[PDB]
Design a protein around this ligand. Structure first.
Ligand SMILES: Nc1ncnc2c1ncn2[C@@H]1O[C@H](COP(=O)(O)OP(=O)(O)O)[C@@H](O)[C@H]1O
Lengths: 50, 250, 48, 195, 50, 201, 195, 50
């Protein structure tokens, strides 16, 4: 019982978090794109995450 | 000024010309052109602008949120049925809050004309009724997809009168550079494969209009930009097996 | 860009053509005009 | 407690319901049995709101609805009876058969000699309106498929050794052929115009 | 909304507005059968009643 | 991982087969599952899988592997070695393995749920007799070669009950077409255009 | 004067005939009409060599072939029944469905009708016997082909959006333990054939 | 800001900056006006935003 239910409850709380380490990789591409355009005469935007 | 669009023409496909027939509050044929450097659409509120916007939308998205701009937040007051039948509804102008210009047997069509560097590519559809019955099935369907200059709604109507859907399918079989599909799923695939993009982008585009209803950046990355990977169903599922195994134990 | 009547001034500064959509009872019509044609027709309205 | 229904009446009633229509020349024993027990048969059928129609002149028995008279469903509908609406070609052939059956019943008696016609005679009548389908084999296939479908409708028999069918008496028992007459007038008008 | 109707007085009833003839005091219409466009016409009655 | 799934599906199949057999105690069923669980810690596949499962609880390597792969793919010549899709897939190896493993857990689940199907409904009353007769029939059916369509179509002595009787072939049921009209909704391709003299100030 | 049966009785019997079974839970009015004149239903089916089956524990009424002075021989040869005869695979799936029905009955009782299982639940239960076609869609096609027919006999509902089906109470009588033993003997005869 | 200042006088609990969200929620507080906060400053210890 312990082994099976524990493997389950871990294969979830890996999967949930592990996504966040993909969302935090897409935002690099936008921060990559938004570096090519001047928002203000010498400024550019960038996205960060807490 | 032209340099700001110098990328245009060369790189991307472009949207230029919209054929309409018996769509929305329009009757007969109507045309518009779009200049290669953009354009604005003007007229008194209540004329056609939301109608035209929506009228292009069908070809690109599987879920048209008609009239989103003035209503972002609640369901559209309109649908494919109402437009195709030409229902003025509350906009009747005194005609019993309904007014219906095409209630009986009727035919309706649309065709947008994308292109790049002279390469025409046309996305067009045809919707028609046989009787006053207004079932979802009553509206018989057919999409088009062609890159041959010889194909237009202005032509397809002539054939649709010359014969049934069998005649149209016969034209497709005999001619070249033309395809048709009774299912929008395969047609949407026929789009995505051509344009090398997933099924996501051509949806977000259909929520560009809703910019009027922004609360903060905090939403643009919670309802529009990011896709869905939620796991409520899975998280619920594991709890079951646990209870069953506790059952065996007891 | 779609937009109601207001601030046509701005759109005259960033476009090369416009599309008018007319409402009349339950028939609605539309035309594609370059800004110059619209200006000439406004001048004629001034002559109207 | 109480007696059962007589065996032969039950068997004959079930037979007719299975077939809808039957002939004395086909099964004379059941024919006579039913006609000797019409009260019993109708009592068996009236709970179903059904009944039988007969034609001793042509020697045919057939079923008939016995609902309450003329409800709002003048274009009647009955639970146990699913109705049908035939197509252009089906009703066209039915009209052809009706006209030639009318002619036969004058030149050969009202069922005294069972109404007959040859395949090579029906085919020209169809060809009047539909024209040549493309080959004699196609003509025969078309007419034979239509005749088989009507036979499933109990209207005609299969062609004999000389490709001559027999028209069932039920053709004389249709409800409102005035529609057939209007259709045939329309067809003759159309062919006269389209020639 | 069901619980709202059960407990909220505001959800126990519905509202509507009638167009009144200043001359005869009769109703001509009870629906804004002249609204549409980008939804910019509904604002008239709403703003007036507010 | 697909191979392990195959083993668990096969075990589920065999367990249901045996349950249809009348001869097992409760102990037999509840013990064969543990014997299976210990059966798949022997093969190279089972060794691999159970070795991996622990390597989420003590996440020593499952950062190292991704990190080093990121290092290798950072080398230029790698571009020639692998086509683009290969590289994208490899970069996210850990996630794809984690999400693949989800399949197997369920593939074992079924058997984890079957046994509970036998503990509760201990045969009793008329249900005992009916279930036992059903089990006898099912077991006997195994003897047959079920592949032949005609055999599967062979008619059985079951009683005709709930008979559907309908569709009387009455003459009145027949109707002909009832319309002959024809007309065209002609094509009005008149080139309409707006009339700028119609709108106001 | 005339032997016309009462209109409500005609309605109820016509419906029962149209669908061959009648549940109080679904159509209580006609069910109670039938159970108010069940002897009338019997004496009307008796002309047709048919009989009324009754199971009030599940609130069910169904029609069954009667015994004539000859017990219908192989009753499936009865003229009126429209359907074919049951076959092996159908009986196999019927047995599995009855197994699930009896399990659900021990769980919740006999009279109710909430029992269900999913397409994927059925698929192994038959796949054990029928071998593997080679693709999941093919075995789903197999199961749906069986289910369409079994619905045609009234045993099950149509496949729902959840790819499940609801067991109809009538299965309690098709899977009669006496009939199950008779089918077991027939299966032993099939073994002798295999021998 | 001018309308916010006036609104502090007429109301029991005026909702500052309402018209920026159509009617949904308020962003600012009362004190920041007194402190003259020039929006959210940079996180590098800031102190230039007050
Ligand atoms: N279901 C409907 N209810 C109200 N008006 C409708 C409906 N369907 C079409 N219309 C009419 O179509 C037009 C839609 O408004 P449009 O002119 O497209 O909006 P805008 O130009 O203000 O964006 C109006 O003429 C409106 O009255």
């Amino acid at each position: 019982l312990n082994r099976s239910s524990d493997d389950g409850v871990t294969q979830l709380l890996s999967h949930i978090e592990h996504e966040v380490l993909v969302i935090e990789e897409r935002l690099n591409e936008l921060n990559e794109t938004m570096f090519r355009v001047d928002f203000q005469p010498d400024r550019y935007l960038r996205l960060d995450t807490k | 000024m032209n340099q700001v669009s110098g990328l245009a023409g060369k790189e991307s496909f472009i949207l230029t010309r919209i054929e309409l027939f018996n769509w929305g509050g329009f009757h007969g044929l109507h045309q518009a052109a779009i200049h290669q450097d953009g354009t604005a659409v003007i007229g008194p509120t209540g004329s056609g602008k939301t109608t035209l916007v929506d009228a292009l939308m069908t070809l690109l998205c599987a879920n048209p949120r008609y009239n989103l701009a003035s209503t972002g937040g609640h369901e559209s007051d309109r649908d494919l049925i109402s437009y195709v039948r030409g229902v003025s509804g509350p906009g009747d102008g005194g005609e019993g809050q309904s007014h219906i210009a095409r209630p009986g047997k009727t035919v309706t069509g649309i065709a947008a004309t994308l292109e790049r560097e002279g390469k025409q590519v046309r996305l067009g559809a045809l919707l028609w009724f046989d009787s006053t019955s207004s079932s979802v099935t009553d509206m018989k369907r057919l999409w088009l997809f062609s890159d041959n200059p010889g194909q237009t709604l202005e032509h397809w109507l002539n054939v649709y009168h010359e014969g049934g859907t069998r005649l149209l399918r016969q034209m497709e079989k005999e001619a070249i550079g033309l395809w048709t599909y009774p299912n929008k799923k395969q047609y949407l695939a026929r789009l995505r494969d051509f344009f090398e993009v997933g099924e996501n982008a051509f949806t977000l585009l259909n929520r560009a209009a809703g910019l009027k209803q922004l609360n903060s950046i905090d939403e643009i990355f919670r309802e529009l930009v990011l896709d869905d990977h939620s796991a409520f169903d899975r998280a619920a599922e594991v709890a079951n097996s646990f209870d069953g195994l506790t059952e065996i134990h007891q | 860009f779609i937009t109601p009547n207001k601030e046509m001034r701005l759109l005259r500064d960033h476009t090369r053509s416009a599309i008018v959509v007319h409402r009349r009872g339950q028939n609605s019509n539309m035309a594609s005009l370059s800004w110059e044609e619209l200006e000439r027709h406004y001048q004629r309205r001034g002559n109207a | 407690s109480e007696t059962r229904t007589l065996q032969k009446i039950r068997e004959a009633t079930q037979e007719l319901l299975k077939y809808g229509l039957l002939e004395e020349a086909s099964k004379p024993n059941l024919y006579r049995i039913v006609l000797s027990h019409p009260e019993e048969v109708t009592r068996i059928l009236e709970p179903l709101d059904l009944d039988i129609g007969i034609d001793e002149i042509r020697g045919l028995l057939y079923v008939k609805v016995r609902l309450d008279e003329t409800p709002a469903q003048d274009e009647w509908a009955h639970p146990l009876v699913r109705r049908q609406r035939l197509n252009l070609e089906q009703s066209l052939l039915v009209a052809i058969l009706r006209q030639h059956f009318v002619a036969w019943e004058q030149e050969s008696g009202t069922g005294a000699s069972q109404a007959q016609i040859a395949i090579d005679d029906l085919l020209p009548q169809l060809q009047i309106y539909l024209g040549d389908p493309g080959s004699e084999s196609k003509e025969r296939t078309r007419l034979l498929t239509l005749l088989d479908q009507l036979k499933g409708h109990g209207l005609v028999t299969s062609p004999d050794a000389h490709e001559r069918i027999v028209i069932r008496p039920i053709i004389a028992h249709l409800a409102d052929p005035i529609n057939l007459q209007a259709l045939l007038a329309w067809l003759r008008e159309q062919i006269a115009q389209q020639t | 909304l069901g619980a709202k109707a059960l407990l909220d007085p505001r959800f126990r009833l519905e509202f509507a507005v009638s167009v009144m003839d200043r001359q005869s005091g009769n109703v001509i219409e009870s629906r804004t059968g002249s609204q549409g466009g980008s939804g910019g016409e509904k604002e008239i009655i709403a703003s007036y009643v507010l | 991982f697909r191979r392990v799934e195959d083993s668990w599906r096969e075990a589920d199949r065999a367990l249901r087969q045996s349950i249809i057999g009348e001869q097992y105690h409760r102990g037999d069923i509840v013990e064969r599952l543990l014997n299976d669980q210990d059966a798949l810690l022997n093969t190279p596949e089972g060794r691999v899988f159970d070795s991996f499962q622990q390597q989420l609880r003590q996440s020593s390597e499952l950062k190292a592997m991704s990190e080093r792969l990121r290092v290798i793919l950072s080398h230029p010549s790698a571009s020639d070695a692998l086509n683009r899709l290969q590289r994208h897939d490899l970069r996210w190896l850990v996630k794809r393995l984690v999400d693949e493993s989800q399949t197997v857990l369920q593939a074992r689940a079924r058997s984890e749920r079957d046994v509970r199907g036998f503990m509760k409904t201990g045969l009793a009353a008329e249900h005992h007799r009916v279930g036992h007769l059903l089990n006898e029939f099912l077991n006997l059916a195994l003897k047959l070669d079920w592949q032949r369509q005609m055999i599967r179509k062979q008619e059985v002595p079951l009683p005709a009950v709930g008979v559907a009787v309908t569709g009387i072939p009455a003459i009145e049921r027949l109707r002909f077409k009832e319309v002959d009209d024809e007309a065209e909704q002609t094509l009005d391709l008149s080139n309409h255009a707006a009339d700028l003299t119609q709108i106001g100030d």
